[PDB]
Amino acid sequence: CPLMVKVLDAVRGSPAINVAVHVFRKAADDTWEPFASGKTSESGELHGLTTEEEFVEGIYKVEIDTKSYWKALGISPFHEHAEVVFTANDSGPRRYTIAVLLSPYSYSTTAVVTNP
């Protein structure tokens, strides 16, 4: 589990459940290639996106579909999505947790990077 994504709802103090997440990797030609996708579980987490061996050095983008999450709750939020873009594994393999905290007009994101 070198990459996991966790999403929380700051209005309810809860996991944000069933949030779509798409991950991309920047190719050598500079385009963004689809890399993995999934949706958050009942705990707000999304595990199993990749493997140590597939998750090579590169620039990755995690796109969180926050707008659909809010719209299903009846809210028209500010952001179209939350996108988190980062270089991974540039000094060897690491485990990444991308946390995102949602409010209708704000989001926060934090990365926790550990060396297993």
Residue 93 interacts with its own copies (CB under 8 A): yes or no: no
- In the numeric block, which tokens belong to residue 62? 């995690």
Q: Does residue 21 belong to the site contacting its own copies (CB under 8 A)?
A: no
Among the listed residues 47, 71, 73, 78, the single contact to its own copies using CB under 8 A? 78
CB of 94 to its own copies, least distance (A): 9
> Binding residue per annotation — 52?
no
Q: What's the rounded Cα separation, in Å, for the pair 93 and 54?
A: 11
Q: For residue 37, which of 47, 29, 49 has the smallest C-alpha distance?
A: 49
Is residue 47 a contact point for its own copies (CB under 8 A)?
no
State yes or no: 67 annotated in a binding site: no
Distances in Å between the Cα of 36 and the Cα atoms of 5, 32, 51, 72, 113 are: 12, 12, 11, 24, 19
Q: Per CB under 8 A, does 95 bind its own copies? A: no
Q: How many residues does the chain have?
A: 116
Does the annotation flag 43 for ligand binding?
Answer: no
Binding status of residue 37 toward its own copies by CB under 8 A:
no
